[PDB]
Design a binder for this molecule. Sequence first.
Ligand SMILES: [Ca+2]
Length: 475
Amino acid sequence: SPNVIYILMDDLGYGDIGCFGQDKIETPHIDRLCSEGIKLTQHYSGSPVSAPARCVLMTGMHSGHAQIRFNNELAERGAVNNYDSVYVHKELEGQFPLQANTMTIGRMMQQAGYTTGCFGKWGLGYPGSEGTPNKQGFDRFYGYNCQRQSHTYYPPFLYNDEERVYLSNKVTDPHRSPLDKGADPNDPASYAKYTQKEYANDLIFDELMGFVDANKRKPFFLMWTTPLPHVSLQAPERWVQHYVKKFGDEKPYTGQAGYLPCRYPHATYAAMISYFDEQIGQLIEKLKAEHLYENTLIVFTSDNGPTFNGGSDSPWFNSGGLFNSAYGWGKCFLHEGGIRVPAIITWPGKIKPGTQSDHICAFQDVMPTLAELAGITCPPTDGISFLPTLLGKKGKQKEHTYLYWEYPDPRIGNKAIRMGKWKGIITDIRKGNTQMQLYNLETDIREEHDVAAQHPDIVKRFERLMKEARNGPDF
Ligand SMILES: [Ca+2]
């Protein structure tokens, strides 16, 4: 029974990595990983935003049954959106917590005899709540507790388990740090203030690598929940200048769509993804040097589809790959562009290299996949193990009747069903819309041609399945 490294990136689109068609952003170590394992082409998140995605991944329940179904900042506590206030008052930090005793994949692997660690970003409970990493199946945690904190990669502090660790970085509000009055928006000098002493991704990595060196002769389950490449656009100058030389000059980003200004927004979005690629490069080198590559299975995926704000340019990178990535089609919506995420798994000598499965699976399935892989009775779950697909024995791969998603955000409100080629969405639910859009993913992968009027029988089946699939108060 092997080691597991579950690498989860943040707002990385279907087509943001070379082996899913990315032309501009170099992902050598990620492509090398693909070439040495199975590429999943119909792998879905729990949600088109972070907290419910990670809730589904951890709990093994789908977005219609899950504890957390939207990004909930608990603003009743006070000035949660003020970074000065959050620096002083940890009671204002982070997001709605998981309940105490919640069976998470971390806790499952723990009572399976695995040393467990999470490194990067949490988002599933505020400091001192019953939902902190260390109380939710993780022996070890390091990085951002809070999704709002990670909006800057030079934060004033991070967490080492339950304790804060203060950094040589001035407290900033990345939503309220415009360019100095009458600074030339075309001079890189005017952006220098968005680079401080300690880049969070450096620290998170040093600590993840320390955890590996610490547990090399032990069975370990390690989740690398990096906040990259979530905006703001901050990356080492080495990696930025690589892409300024490649892409050439470009219009500066001056914060029009929130987060920090950025002189070279394209070059910097690339730099961010290549920087992280290179970290994966060093991890693999260490696994090999410590003779662990053969006994270590590795997942690489993204928590949701690509974004529309913060100086991101998803259309220019075609970050959605097969799917549209403009606002409405990606992050925050149940269009394929937002919920389908690139997925790679390697287990050398067990998984077959250079292979591909189009098996329909999702974050729910990760719990039972790990339970089967670890030889342990699976807790209750909405998941179906996809270990049979990983090991080439399609003959014993159970299939979902259908997949359900709901994102009951306060503004819009979204429910969706996939069942074979048929993909139904109800959006604008908050505005009182009950009308379903129906897409044939086999003839219409970009979901640009509603055919709900032509299949009243399928719409009705889907309407009933949406009622059966879900728990809790409706919206
Ligand atoms: Ca995300």
